[PDB]
Amino acid sequence: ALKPLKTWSHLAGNRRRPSEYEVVSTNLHYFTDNPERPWELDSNLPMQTWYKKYCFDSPLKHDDWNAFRDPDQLVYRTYNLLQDGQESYVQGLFDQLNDRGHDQMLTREWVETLARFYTPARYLFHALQMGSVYIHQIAPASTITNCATYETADHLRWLTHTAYRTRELANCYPDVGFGKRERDVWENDPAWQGFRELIEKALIAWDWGEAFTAINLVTKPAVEEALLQQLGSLAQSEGDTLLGLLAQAQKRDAERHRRWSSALVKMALEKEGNREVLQKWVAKWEPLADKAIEAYCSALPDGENAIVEAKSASRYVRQMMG
Amino acid sequence: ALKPLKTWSHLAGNRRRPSEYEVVSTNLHYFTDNPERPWELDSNLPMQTWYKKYCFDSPLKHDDWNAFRDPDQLVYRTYNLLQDGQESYVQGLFDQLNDRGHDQMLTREWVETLARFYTPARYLFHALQMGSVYIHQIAPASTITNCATYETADHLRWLTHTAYRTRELANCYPDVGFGKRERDVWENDPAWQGFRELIEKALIAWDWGEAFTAINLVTKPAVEEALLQQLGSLAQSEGDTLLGLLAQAQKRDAERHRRWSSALVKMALEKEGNREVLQKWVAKWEPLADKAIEAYCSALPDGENAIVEAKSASRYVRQMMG
Amino acid sequence: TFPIMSNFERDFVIQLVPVDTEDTMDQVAEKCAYHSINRRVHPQPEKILRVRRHEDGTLFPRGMIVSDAGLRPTETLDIIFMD
Amino acid sequence: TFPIMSNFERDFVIQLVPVDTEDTMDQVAEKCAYHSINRRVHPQPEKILRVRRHEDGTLFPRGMIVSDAGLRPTETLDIIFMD
Amino acid sequence: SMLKREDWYDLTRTTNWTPKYVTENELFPEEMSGARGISMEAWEKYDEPYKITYPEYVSIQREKDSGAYSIKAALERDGFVDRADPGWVSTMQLHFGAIALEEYAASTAEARMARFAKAPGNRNMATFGMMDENRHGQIQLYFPYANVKRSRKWDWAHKAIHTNEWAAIAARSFFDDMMMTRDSVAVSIMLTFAFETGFTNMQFLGLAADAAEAGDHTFASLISSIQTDESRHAQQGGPSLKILVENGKKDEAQQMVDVAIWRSWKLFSVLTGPIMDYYTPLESRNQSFKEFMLEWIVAQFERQLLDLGLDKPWYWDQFMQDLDETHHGMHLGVWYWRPTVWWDPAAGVSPEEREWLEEKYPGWNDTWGQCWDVITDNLVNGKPELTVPETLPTICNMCNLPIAHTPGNKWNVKDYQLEYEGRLYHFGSEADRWCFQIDPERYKNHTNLVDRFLKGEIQPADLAGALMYMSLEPGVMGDDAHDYEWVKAYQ
Amino acid sequence: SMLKREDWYDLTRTTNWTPKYVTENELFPEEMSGARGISMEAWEKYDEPYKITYPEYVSIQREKDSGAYSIKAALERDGFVDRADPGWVSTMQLHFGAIALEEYAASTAEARMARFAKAPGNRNMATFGMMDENRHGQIQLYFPYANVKRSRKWDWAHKAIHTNEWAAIAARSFFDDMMMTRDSVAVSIMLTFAFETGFTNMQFLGLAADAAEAGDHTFASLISSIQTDESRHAQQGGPSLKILVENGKKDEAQQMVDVAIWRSWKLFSVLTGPIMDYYTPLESRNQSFKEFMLEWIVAQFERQLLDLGLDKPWYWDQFMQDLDETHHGMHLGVWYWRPTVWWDPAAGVSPEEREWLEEKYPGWNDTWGQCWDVITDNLVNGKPELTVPETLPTICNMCNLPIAHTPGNKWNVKDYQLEYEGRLYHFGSEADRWCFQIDPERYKNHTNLVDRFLKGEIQPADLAGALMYMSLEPGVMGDDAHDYEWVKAYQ
Ligand SMILES: [Fe+3]
Numbered sequence A, B: 001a002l003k004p005l006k007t008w009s010h011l012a013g014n015r016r017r018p019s020e021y022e023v024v025s026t027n028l029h030y031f032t033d034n035p036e037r038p039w040e041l042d043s044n045l046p047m048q049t050w051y052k053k054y055c056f057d058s059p060l061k062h063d064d065w066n067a068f069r070d071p072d073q074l075v076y077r078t079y080n081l082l083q084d085g086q087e088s089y090v091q092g093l094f095d096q097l098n099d100r101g102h103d104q105m106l107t108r109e110w111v112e113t114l115a116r117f118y119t120p121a122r123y124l125f126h127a128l129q130m131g132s133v134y135i136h137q138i139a140p141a142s143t144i145t146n147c148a149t150y151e152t153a154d155h156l157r158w159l160t161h162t163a164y165r166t167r168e169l170a171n172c173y174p175d176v177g178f179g180k181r182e183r184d185v186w187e188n189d190p191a192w193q194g195f196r197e198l199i200e201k202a203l204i205a206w207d208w209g210e211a212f213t214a215i216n217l218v219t220k221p222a223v224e225e226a227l228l229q230q231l232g233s234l235a236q237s238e239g240d241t242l243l244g245l246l247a248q249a250q251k252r253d254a255e256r257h258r259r260w261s262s263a264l265v266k267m268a269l270e271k272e273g274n275r276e277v278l279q280k281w282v283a284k285w286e287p288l289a290d291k292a293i294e295a296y297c298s299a300l301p302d303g304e305n306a307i308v309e310a311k312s313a314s315r316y317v318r319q320m321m322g
Numbered sequence C, D: 001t002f003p004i005m006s007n008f009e010r011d012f013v014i015q016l017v018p019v020d021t022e023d024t025m026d027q028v029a030e031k032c033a034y035h036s037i038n039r040r041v042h043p044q045p046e047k048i049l050r051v052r053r054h055e056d057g058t059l060f061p062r063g064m065i066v067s068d069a070g071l072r073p074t075e076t077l078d079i080i081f082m083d
Numbered sequence E, F: 001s002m003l004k005r006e007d008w009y010d011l012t013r014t015t016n017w018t019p020k021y022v023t024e025n026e027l028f029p030e031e032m033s034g035a036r037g038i039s040m041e042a043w044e045k046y047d048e049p050y051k052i053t054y055p056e057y058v059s060i061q062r063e064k065d066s067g068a069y070s071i072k073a074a075l076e077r078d079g080f081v082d083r084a085d086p087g088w089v090s091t092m093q094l095h096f097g098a099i100a101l102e103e104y105a106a107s108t109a110e111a112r113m114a115r116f117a118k119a120p121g122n123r124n125m126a127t128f129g130m131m132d133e134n135r136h137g138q139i140q141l142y143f144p145y146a147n148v149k150r151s152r153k154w155d156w157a158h159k160a161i162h163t164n165e166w167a168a169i170a171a172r173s174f175f176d177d178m179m180m181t182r183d184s185v186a187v188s189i190m191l192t193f194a195f196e197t198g199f200t201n202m203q204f205l206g207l208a209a210d211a212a213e214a215g216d217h218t219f220a221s222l223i224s225s226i227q228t229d230e231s232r233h234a235q236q237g238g239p240s241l242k243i244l245v246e247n248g249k250k251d252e253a254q255q256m257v258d259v260a261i262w263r264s265w266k267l268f269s270v271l272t273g274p275i276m277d278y279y280t281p282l283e284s285r286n287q288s289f290k291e292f293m294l295e296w297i298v299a300q301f302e303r304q305l306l307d308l309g310l311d312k313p314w315y316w317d318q319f320m321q322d323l324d325e326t327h328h329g330m331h332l333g334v335w336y337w338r339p340t341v342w343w344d345p346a347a348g349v350s351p352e353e354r355e356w357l358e359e360k361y362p363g364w365n366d367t368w369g370q371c372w373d374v375i376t377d378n379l380v381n382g383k384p385e386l387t388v389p390e391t392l393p394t395i396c397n398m399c400n401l402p403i404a405h406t407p408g409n410k411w412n413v414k415d416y417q418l419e420y421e422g423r424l425y426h427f428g429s430e431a432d433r434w435c436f437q438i439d440p441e442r443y444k445n446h447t448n449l450v451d452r453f454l455k456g457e458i459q460p461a462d463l464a465g466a467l468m469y470m471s472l473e474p475g476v477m478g479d480d481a482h483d484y485e486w487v488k489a490y491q
């Protein structure tokens, strides 16, 4: 008869005692059990074809994607403990900066810059949310999926901060159009068209490997450097201590996404040919990111400098991954 | 035989169902059961005499001090939930403002103002801690004691914020003397002598009623307006966003202390003669508070104005209590 | 070997029962009874076990063989007690 | 009425036992036995109950009365079984 | 100060825009979106009734886990699982093996809506739903993991769905059909409305009740806590259904509801029915599986369908009658074929239990009791070899469950066969065959356990071989829960 | 980034200053400070071993309550208290009535140190200690409050310390002497070192163990959680003792330790001893009260006193022998006078229990068993009127507990009387009388229950009158826990 183990049978002989993270996250997807018929139905259904083409047939390869491990080892339980603390901080900032009338002290010029450059990001942030939730459903391992899961929740977090602040700004400056105009700015303003073209096209890159690359490796670093880093620094220098601190807080989530993305690339580089596959996707998408950064930052004060810094910092993210 | 009740027998027939707050806080002191021998020992012991003289014989009177109710209804459980949230905010400020090198951006002049006006408050804050913990042990009702209990914890909270920041400042400006010099400033600097004389004398007002008045009604409002309000506003205008936000956060605890202090005075005014007793103690102590505010604020930039504002705001606290 | 699904009278479930193409309905019923009689269905010594196509109810002669029954593989058959 | 503390032999606790100043040691012992004998101490028909000052062990004559014993109020007395 | 939620909530869901660099059809492919010709503007009428924002979510969910994990740690060294009733133990092992990884898979079904739904409010609620199922999958691995050293059966909390054991195939058949291979809108309807709102939301309530009654406070708190997350995301189907009805798609909506409710019912008849009427100790039975279904499931569906402007499915009457039988057959099937499952089925046919069964189901002893009579006599007369099978039962090509029904004096076992393109399919009911006929291409070349056995895919081609094919080995293979203790009541 | 605690901790305790507007003696009055001639600079050497800062405190304590209150709410409707053993129920009612408000009073003892200690580190740790006891008092009201509808006895969790019931007088006698009427330094020694470190820290561990063993997970989690707060503030005495020894005050330190340990022991002999050897079901007894004391209390004290450079108290040998008897007398006293307490004392003298007692205490049946023999015969022969008293027991003027000791074949009951200024005092032991003689003015005119009865303060002057004086009425007045069930074993 079979004797009981001290851990899950798939983790047996793991050497060291399995952590809570490994216990709850590993080897959970079952659609990868039968590559020729992932789902328990007719093998010709559209979804069968979708996973075979965009998951199984991807040019990013490994023999054991399930070996991937999130460097932050995020679990649901710890994700909520972490973010509940971070939200207590952000909520406190909102509450107390409101108490001292922070918004009433902004210059008219800065308020107009916010209407153009800031509020409309609720569209870009939600697009990132959709972008990462797609990675969630097409990745080949549960440990990879979870990272995308929490990343998606973070994107919704930014969207939410943005929605909240848009309301406060509208209340303080009802004539600016905060809350009403964002869609028209996102759709029409030349400052946003680079980012809009980039994310719209990236949202239809179905291959899990290309989605990971287009979203995580190319688009997010460009959005983060432009909207959080550059706009955030500008905010501070313009007297908007709130946006300056908010952007820095959201950057913490972005740093975490870069950490797991970096670990996945590191694992992919264990196999010959993946470096080239990834660099090929980066060369395809990078030009749209440059375009996004250029159109957005050039419209900001001292744009030429902001552009160089954003281009430099975003590229550095990938350079340090090899 | 005695039939079981639906609540504590001392709360029976309370009309409305007793709250968690009333359930855990009311009618807990037993030394008030026998005014002639509060403690279960010889009636002539020094502590018997101490409570008979400073608790029972106080000129602040009521027939039922146990009827007092904290307006915030603070319990241990809820106190920790509340402050854990507020500390997550303050800790986040410390952590993230440090990340962006906030301290390195202060002007040399402001750094020197901090060494004089800010760090040494660890002595004044601890003295407040000692001041409120004494009120805790000599008050005639447990509901009054608890308010002093949580207030004492808040004073230790301010001391702690101050100790932490003093270290950070010393690390950033090791030549200023942060952490070493505070005692000499507190003891010798004319700017602190008003407050020092005020708190030292108030710390030996043993009568529970006079202690409550000297500490809560007169000293704290003067310290809060000078060190939190005035110094805090100055900090903001001088580029120290951290101290500006920290002082505002600590002011929230101060507002809460004023709320229960206001409720106790309101209850005391139900009895004839207490208004006069309280106004008599206020007239005795108020002159030392004016002196404290004058010596401290006059040394700050635009001191004359700071003095008028602090005097005005602190007096308003008592005026609104009648 | 020919597979058929056995729906034995008074039983609660239809079962897979492999038979032979040369088997007689009586021999088919014998192979089916193996998985039902004395397992969850009581014997009926008096009665005789008969086989009928489940879909349309066609009754097959005791002596007819599987090979001439014009069954579809996996065809469901009712095994009933008769006189 | 005169109070004394009764430390009854073989019992486990000293008890408050009010006696009368005119009582005899034998009558004192009788009042003490009430709170010990047949409650947590077995009777000893053969023996005789005697009273002695607990502090110094002074044995009092069966016929001596409380009033002449020179007891202090609340004095502890041992009630012992003797021949 | 802080804003009230109602003042800014809508901005969190004002996220649709008009694509320019790609087409709307490329961005929201029909096979994934299921917008069904209904415009983006019309889908924007979607309005979830139970609203929640990010900060509220992490705060509230943080406290839920603090509580559940605290209960677990406080009762862990008490070893309740070592003295719990065998029927209860088997109930949990069955629960975890069937559910754990399907809960996790549900996070992908939610993710399907989070990306592809054209209704903004649907995309955000699905993001929270995605997080909820992530929690459900993780916590339902974490809790049973505490018992891996007690029995290999607990390892199936992870393993089950990775095997070809018949029950697991039935589970994937249902879940993959309902939530993994359907467009966004179909998922909100079939999963969220039909299965979660209609079945599990109330069931978990009863499960948590039974756990408490059994003295298992750890499991009681677990299920109880998970249950509270359900409403938050189970709400998603309603609004979708109203949108489809408001426009010209009521029949399409009705057909999805009909299918999903039937498939959910069949899975339920095997995973819950047997447990309520047989595994739970007689003294701890509040009501019968049938009573539970009527009071808590059937009434609610009629209520819901009425309010949405939908009808009762065509099979409603048959469904009503089947409440008397179906689960009794699934229980008998599972117990008889016990060695084919990863938990120990409890016979539940002692004299006391049989009289209860007769009360709740008049005619049980004349029908179902008959089979159990033969089984008992054999056990009494030392013929246990006749209480285990020597062949495979006929499997339904839709629900992948055994085709079973009323036996004994009211014998009524039927097979709704269907010949399609040269192949003969078997169905355990009229509705099961119907599910196949309204969309044959979706099921066509799928093969159930029997089909595979007959095709030669199971080798060696015998029971021992079928057992290895299902990853079953001594130690996990099931047997009678109380070790035939109940037989003594008959000698 | 964030600083490490060690980098800034000291600044939180660099708070002493040289008073100028008042004198040092006015600011720190000797009767409240107890600096004892030792300078402020010398007290500054005080260095608490278990450090903690405000933010760490609220975070950690927040989680402790979340856990404890979560366990309570999850098990509340299970009604364990309604089916728990009577001895266990009585154990909790005794616990809550004696402790709840004394825990709260301890927050004032801590506050005494927070204000008046000259050692800065002592003042901050006492502020956290003040908060800990605030928690202990509140949570120990909150938990029993859940049972007020079950019996009036639960109301004594609040009431007890407000009455003149003898047990409560004994409690206040101890607590007021140790922590409420002593200078700051004396409190750190007598309360923090002697009582909390020496007794309760380990006891609560055993109590929580017994609760778990009894199946009371709510109470188990409660006590277990409270216990973890203990070390944090129980540490305060050590450093104070080292300071007194380093300077010229070792004898003063030794005398405080001797007194506090003895008084703590006497309270313990009545509140814990009886419970361990009689109320807890025989099958759930890990060790005897004596074994517990030796393994967990006595050894630790010797260890501690050695490391501090102190001696074993002069009464150590007697204390060792008394472990065989004292509690047996307190138990017999409490059971016999059962109607004078607010809980139901469990006799614990069934045949099985008596053989266990003989094992753990050779000679028990020849001594203690004798009294219980008479009691049993009377109960068997229908003479229950002889198992309740008709007078008051002699009370010790120090511990305010009955003066009782070895009965039967080794009769050794003694009274250490003392005449002081015209009054005759009674003491239950040599050390109790000693506590009085080293400081007569502290106890002199205090009167125990008997003194009051004899002075005419209890009217009417009879038992019914004494009962009303103690606020005891039918419903709360104690009786045999198992309702004399154990008598049947003797016919
Ligand atoms: Fe779920």
Ligand SMILES: [Fe+3]
Pocket: E106, E133, E196, E230, E233
């Ligand atoms: Fe769900």
Ligand SMILES: [Fe+3]
Pocket: F103, F106, F132, F133, F136
């Ligand atoms: Fe405590």
Ligand SMILES: [Fe+3]
Pocket: F106, F133, F196, F230, F233
């Ligand atoms: Fe304590």
Ligand SMILES: [O-]
Pocket: E132, E133, E136, E226, E229, E230
């Ligand atoms: O769920």
Ligand SMILES: [O-]
Pocket: F132, F133, F136, F226, F229, F230
């Ligand atoms: O404690």
